[PDB]
């Protein structure tokens, strides 16, 4: 653990998903979760660096990765019908990517 700074993506994902999935969970401010997950889209698309932050795109490509990738859909469709599923991918992965 903490090889250098204990950075890792999973680490920011645990809370980057909690601070997001919570802003929607019972905050009725899905717009807020979109701001904490906004960098989690870019910090997930830029690509893997070392070989540690790759237990999500290769384990659950459909998780957060797809729960967000539906941006062109969440933008034009803007239907909570995608967010209700994104919450499932976020919550379903919240335990998966957790590695409890």
- What is the 3D form? globular
Helix and strand element order: HHHHHH
**Rg to the nearest angstrom?**
13 Å
Q: How many β strands by DSSP? A: 0
- Counted by DSSP, the helix tally is 6
- Would you identify the CATH H-level superfamily? FKBP12-rapamycin binding domain
Distance between the termini: 15 Å
Largest sheet: none
The CATH top-level class label: Mainly Alpha
The helix fraction, in percent, is: 55-70%
Main structural class: mainly alpha
Strand % is: under 5%
User: How many domains make up the 3D coordinates?
Assistant: 1
* CATH topology description: Four Helix Bundle (Hemerythrin (Met), subunit A)
Give the CATH architecture. Answer: Up-down Bundle
Region (Sufficient for interaction with the FKBP1A/rapamycin complex): 1-100
Subcellular location: Lysosome membrane; Endoplasmic reticulum membrane; Golgi apparatus membrane; Cell membrane
Cross-link (Glycyl lysine isopeptide (Lys-Gly) (interchain with G-Cter in ubiquitin)): 52
Family: Belongs to the PI3/PI4-kinase family.
């Amino acid at each position: 653990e903490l090889i250098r700074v204990a950075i890792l993506w999973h680490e920011m994902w645990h809370e980057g998903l909690e601070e997001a999935s919570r802003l929607y969970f019972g905050e009725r401010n899905v717009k807020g979760m979109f701001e904490v997950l906004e960098p989690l889209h870019a910090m997930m698309e830029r690509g893997p660096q070392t070989l540690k932050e790759t237990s999500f795109n290769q384990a659950y490509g459909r998780d957060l990765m797809e729960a967000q990738e539906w941006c062109r859909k969440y933008m034009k469709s803007g239907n909570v019908k995608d967010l209700t599923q994104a919450w499932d991918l976020y919550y379903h992965v919240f335990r998966r990517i957790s590695k409890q």
